[PDB]
Amino acid sequence: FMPPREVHVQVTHSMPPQKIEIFKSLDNWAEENILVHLKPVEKCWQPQDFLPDPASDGFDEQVRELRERAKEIPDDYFVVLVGDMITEEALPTYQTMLNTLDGVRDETGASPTSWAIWTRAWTAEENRHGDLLNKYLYLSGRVDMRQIEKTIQYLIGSGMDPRTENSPYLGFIYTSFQERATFISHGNTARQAKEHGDIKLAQICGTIAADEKRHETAYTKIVEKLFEIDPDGTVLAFADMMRKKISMPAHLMYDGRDDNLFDHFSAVAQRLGVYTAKDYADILEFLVGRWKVDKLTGLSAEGQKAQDYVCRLPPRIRRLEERAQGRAKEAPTMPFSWIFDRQVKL
Amino acid sequence: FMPPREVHVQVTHSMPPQKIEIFKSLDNWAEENILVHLKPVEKCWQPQDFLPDPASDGFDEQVRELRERAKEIPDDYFVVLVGDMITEEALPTYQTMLNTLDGVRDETGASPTSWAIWTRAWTAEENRHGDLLNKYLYLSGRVDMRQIEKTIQYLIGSGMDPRTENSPYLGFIYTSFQERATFISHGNTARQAKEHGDIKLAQICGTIAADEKRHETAYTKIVEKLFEIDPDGTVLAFADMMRKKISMPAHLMYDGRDDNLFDHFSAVAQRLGVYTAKDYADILEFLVGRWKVDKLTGLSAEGQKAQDYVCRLPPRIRRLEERAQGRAKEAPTMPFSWIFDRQVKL
Numbered sequence: 001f002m003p004p005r006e007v008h009v010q011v012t013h014s015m016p017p018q019k020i021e022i023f024k025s026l027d028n029w030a031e032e033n034i035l036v037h038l039k040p041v042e043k044c045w046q047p048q049d050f051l052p053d054p055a056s057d058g059f060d061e062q063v064r065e066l067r068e069r070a071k072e073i074p075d076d077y078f079v080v081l082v083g084d085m086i087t088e089e090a091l092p093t094y095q096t097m098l099n100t101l102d103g104v105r106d107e108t109g110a111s112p113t114s115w116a117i118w119t120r121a122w123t124a125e126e127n128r129h130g131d132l133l134n135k136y137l138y139l140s141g142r143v144d145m146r147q148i149e150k151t152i153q154y155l156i157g158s159g160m161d162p163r164t165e166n167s168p169y170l171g172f173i174y175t176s177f178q179e180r181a182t183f184i185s186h187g188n189t190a191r192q193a194k195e196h197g198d199i200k201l202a203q204i205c206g207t208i209a210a211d212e213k214r215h216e217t218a219y220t221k222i223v224e225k226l227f228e229i230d231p232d233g234t235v236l237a238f239a240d241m242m243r244k245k246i247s248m249p250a251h252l253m254y255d256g257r258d259d260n261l262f263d264h265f266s267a268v269a270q271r272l273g274v275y276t277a278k279d280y281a282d283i284l285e286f287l288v289g290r291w292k293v294d295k296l297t298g299l300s301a302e303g304q305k306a307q308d309y310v311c312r313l314p315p316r317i318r319r320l321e322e323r324a325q326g327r328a329k330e331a332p333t334m335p336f337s338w339i340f341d342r343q344v345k346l
Numbered sequence: 347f348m349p350p351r352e353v354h355v356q357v358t359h360s361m362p363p364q365k366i367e368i369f370k371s372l373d374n375w376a377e378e379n380i381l382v383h384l385k386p387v388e389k390c391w392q393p394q395d396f397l398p399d400p401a402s403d404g405f406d407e408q409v410r411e412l413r414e415r416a417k418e419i420p421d422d423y424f425v426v427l428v429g430d431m432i433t434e435e436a437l438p439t440y441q442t443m444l445n446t447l448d449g450v451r452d453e454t455g456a457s458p459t460s461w462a463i464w465t466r467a468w469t470a471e472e473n474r475h476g477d478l479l480n481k482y483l484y485l486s487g488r489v490d491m492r493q494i495e496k497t498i499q500y501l502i503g504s505g506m507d508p509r510t511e512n513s514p515y516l517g518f519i520y521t522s523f524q525e526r527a528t529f530i531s532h533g534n535t536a537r538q539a540k541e542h543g544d545i546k547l548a549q550i551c552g553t554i555a556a557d558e559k560r561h562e563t564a565y566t567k568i569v570e571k572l573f574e575i576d577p578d579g580t581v582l583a584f585a586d587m588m589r590k591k592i593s594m595p596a597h598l599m600y601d602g603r604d605d606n607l608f609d610h611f612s613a614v615a616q617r618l619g620v621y622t623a624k625d626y627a628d629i630l631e632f633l634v635g636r637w638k639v640d641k642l643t644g645l646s647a648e649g650q651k652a653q654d655y656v657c658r659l660p661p662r663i664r665r666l667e668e669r670a671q672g673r674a675k676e677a678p679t680m681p682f683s684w685i686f687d688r689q690v691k692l
């Protein structure tokens with residue numbers, strides 16, 4: 001039946017028109033400072049590096065092993081991993097999302113601009129994450145590929161509205177935050193697969209995280225350059241995003257069966273510690289430290305307000321969650337269509 | 347090393363600005379006439395419907411069968427199928443490509459416009475094609491998934507410039523043509539897999555073709571509505587596309603090894619009859635018949651020229667190829683990295 005829809009009213013082009021040049025001029029900078037964070041394709045890993053080799057005499061035992069190993073991984077973990085993969089699979093959305101950003105958008109799909117080249121290349125690198133996880137999940141035999149496939153269709157057709165308002169200020173702060181968010185997630189699913197005694201699974205999550213660490217560096221560099229060129233406007237963007245809260249890229253998630261699928265998935269991510277509310281705050285605190293927002297001069301009346309709010313927010317959010325956490329009650333066990341309606345503790 | 351790049355000079359916004367409304371107003375029409383050609387997600391097939399069931403006691407024998415069956419399929423066919431799949435996999439490009447089209451582009455990634463909803467939904471349906479083919483190819487064990495994965499990365503990062511110039515006139519004629527092109531391809535790979543005695547493979551190609559037939563109907567309806575609303579401009583678009591020739595969506599194809607990969611792939615598609623130059627002309631002739639271009643009144647000096655040229659082109663192209671075909675010499679055998687450098691006849 002009917003999937004979820006963005007409840008917030010839609011806003012387009014919140015950025016002043018003239019300033020687009022600030023991104024048209026930074027073309028040279030981008031080549032020297034963002035395009036370096038790209039791996040040449042020949043040097044890149046590919047999903048096959050991490051999956052059974054179908055053209056190998058060892059393919060059968062390889063798959064048989066992957067599957068033995070999988071049994072020892074509990075369902076809750078699978079639910080999280082699946083959510084992850086579904087997010088990663090909705091990639092066509094995210095390339096489209098970067099092609100709405102006013103200062104950078106690829107005008108033809110093959111535009112030689114540094115910004116477009118970065119976009120096409122980043123998409124290319126991300127495409128690997130979906131594939132690798134998909135085939136791992138598929139072979140594992142622990143999840144319901146059909147329902148997962150269905151969720152993905154519902155997701156791609158729903159789209160996303162990250163409320164970036166076509167602003168590269170907001171957009172690049174979003175991606176900055178998101179890329180770090182998945183990085184923490186993946187590193188935890190890595191660290192947790194290690195614990196469940198599956199190193200080959202750890203490696204999968206591991207090397208995806210690698211890509212995210214690199215992408216995050218690229219985006220945290222673009223924000224750093226915007227803090228120097230436009231100290232006030234960047235602070236205004238950074239504050240604006242924090243008040244709206246960062247709505248995750250896969251929140252319209254729907255399996256034809258759970259009207260609050262994303263909330264439930266996120267709850268399982270929480271209990272296991274793949275991505276907690278602490279992590280959310282920790283990311284923020286890191287970005288304030290990374291951009292040295294604590295120390296900036298030349299701020300307008302609203303800018304100083306936009307600064308202080310942002311700077312005091314991490315200990316605030318942490319403590320907000322703190323007391324919510326030490327009052328949270330026992331959560332119910334709920335079925336997930338991703339796992340044939342087997343039940344995990346929320 | 348370095349992939350191929352678009353040799354033609356880039357052109358943006360070839361459409362007059364005012365007319366965008368003709369696409370802003372057709373929002374209602376689109377809901378009644380294009381959105382109907384969408385399958386509800388619950389009714390859609392998913393790749394799992396066509397692949398071994400990893401959560402089934404039968405998974406092992408299923409895979410073992412898929413693989414036995416594959417051996418009987420010759421390498422040349424695999425090369426074509428692989429090209430196909432690589433094209434289909436570069437999907438994020440094509441969603442981006444539809445979001446450059448001036449009259450339809452999704453402004454936020456979640457815009458409630460009939461045009462955006464169609465875009466997100468079509469992308470969602472297409473995502474299934476890549477997956478299904480990918481996993482089939484993977485399990486088969488007859489192709490080199492790593493090299494295929496690499497090609498895909500080179501492709502997504504290269505992008506495409508279909509020379510639609512942000513015009514929905516040109517763009518929707520392009521997609522109209524492309525969707526029919528893949529339809530003929532897939533139906534032939536279906537019909538050919540039948541012949542090599544693999545019905546489960548035929549079914550895969552079969553049900554993908556199904557999606558393409560539907561998409562083609564939707565797009566050939568949008569052109570039909572543009573032939574009625576703007577008889578002259580549509581003919582001008584249709585002529586313009588034919589003179590530039592339709593550059594296929596996967597032409598920048600590169601495996602780090604073959605500087606003319608796309609030409610060689612296309613040559614194998616040709617020899618086998620998956621997609622010949624005849625087919626190209628046959629599609630054209632069908633579209634002239636489909637849109638009744640043969641019979642249109644009220645055409646400008648250039649429009650009548652744009653009409654006649656287009657109408658006489660199918661027997662022209664066919665005969666051009668005819669004599670090229672009856673003079674073509676024996677083609678060399680060439681290695682493909684998609685098949686571990688085994689060699690097929692071009």
Ligand SMILES: [Fe+3]
Pocket residue numbers: 088126129182
């Ligand atoms: Fe990713």
Ligand SMILES: [Fe+3]
Pocket residue numbers: 126179182212215
């Ligand atoms: Fe990412």
Ligand SMILES: [Fe+3]
Pocket residue numbers: 434472475528
């Ligand atoms: Fe397709």
Ligand SMILES: [Fe+3]
Pocket residue numbers: 472525528558561
């Ligand atoms: Fe298609």
Ligand SMILES: [Zn+2]
Pocket residue numbers: 089127130131
């Ligand atoms: Zn994918």
Ligand SMILES: [Zn+2]
Pocket residue numbers: 435473476477
């Ligand atoms: Zn895909």
